[PDB]
From a paper:
We reasoned that the replacement of this salt bridge by a covalent crosslink could pre-organize the bioactive conformation of the two-helix motif in solution and thereby increase the binding affinity for TEAD. The overall structure of the complex between 4E (orange) and mTEAD4 (grey) is very similar to the two-helix motif (blue) of VGL4 in its bound form with the structures of mTEAD4 in both complexes superimposing closely (RMSD = 0.949 Å). The electron density for 4E is well defined, clearly revealing the backbone conformation and orientation of the side chains. Also, both peptides exhibit a similar overall conformation (RMSD: 0.56 Å) thereby presenting analogous side chains towards the shallow hydrophobic groove on mTEAD4. Consistent with the crystal structure, we identified interface residues H237, F238, L242, W246, and I249.
A prime example are the members of the transcriptional enhanced associate domain (TEAD) family which are downstream effectors of the Hippo signalling pathway and crucially involved in tissue homeostasis, cell proliferation, and organ growth control, such as in the heart. Here, we report the development of a proteomimetic molecule that stabilizes a two-helix arrangement derived from VGL4 designed to bind TEAD and to inhibit its interaction with VGL4. We report the structure-based design of a cell-permeable, macrocyclic proteomimetic that is derived from a two-helix motif originating from the transcriptional co-repressor VGL4 and was designed to bind the TEAD transcription factor.
Numbering used by the authors:
A (entry chain A): 210 to 232, 235 to 250, 255 to 427
B (entry chain B): 8 to 27
Write the structure that this text describes.
């Protein structure tokens, strides 16, 4: 169940909001963690083809460049059961951590896609930190882009859960983590989304992406 | 824009929600 290639493992990923240094007191929208357990191992790109970019540099081309073991699909059920966004003065962020056996400089590109078309991209570079015999990489508290903050505002205030799911059917994120020096794909993660019911927290299911 | 996304996804329903 690890999002791990031969060269890189994403151990943790969370997106959250909190009061601007009012905390502990955060709310997680989505969360993958070693701290948090979770429970069909592959999905073919044909199932998600139109939900991601597919031109030069697109998902299919990236997959064909490989390596095949670097490509994953994560389905998230996002927990929007919070009122912090309505109070204002909130901080919205994303934190991730990775590990490798190798010392690398990595670049994480995150593309937000609407109906399969990129609308915003964030690029972050991180450096290896040796700890207890392996290399750790952290992207800590990266602020969510304004597009996504506004999207969450508008989404959480629709009148029906099913409408939230409809909006989310054509909202995706494509994360590509590359080795900065070689441009090798270390990890490529396609994210698709639904909302959690009010009585449930965030959930996820992880798949390997394949292409028959 | 976020508004354009919502209008594409929800059709006339979003037009009604946004207006009123």
């Amino acid at each position: 169940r690890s999002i791990a290639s031969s060269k890189l493992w994403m151990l943790e990923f969370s997106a959250f909001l909190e009061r601007q240094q009012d905390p502990y007191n955060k709310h997680l929208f989505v969360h993958i963690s070693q701290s948090s357990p979770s429970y069909l191992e592959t999905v073919d790109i044909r199932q998600i083809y139109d939900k991601f970019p597919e031109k030069k540099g697109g998902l299919k081309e990236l997959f064909e460049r490989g390596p095949s073991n670097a490509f994953f699909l994560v389905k998230f059920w996002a927990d929007l059961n919070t009122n912090i966004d309505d109070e204002g003065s909130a901080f919205y962020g994303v934190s991730s951590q990775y590990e490798s056996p190798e010392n690398m400089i990595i670049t994480c590109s995150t593309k937000v896609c609407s109906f399969g078309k990129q609308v915003v991209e964030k690029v972050e570079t991180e450096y290896a930190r040796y700890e207890n015999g392996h290399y750790l990489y952290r992207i800590h508290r990266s602020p969510l882009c304004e597009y996504m903050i506004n999207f969450i505002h508008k989404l959480k205030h629709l009148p029906e859960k099913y409408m939230m799911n409809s909006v989310l059917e054509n909202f995706t994120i494509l994360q590509v983590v590359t080795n900065r020096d070689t441009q090798e794909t270390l990890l490529c993660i396609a994210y698709v989304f639904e909302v959690s019911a009010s009585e449930h927290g965030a959930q996820h299911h992880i798949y390997r992406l394949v292409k028959e | 824009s976020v508004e354009d996304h919502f209008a594409k996804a929800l059709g006339d329903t979003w037009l009604q929600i946004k207006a009123a």
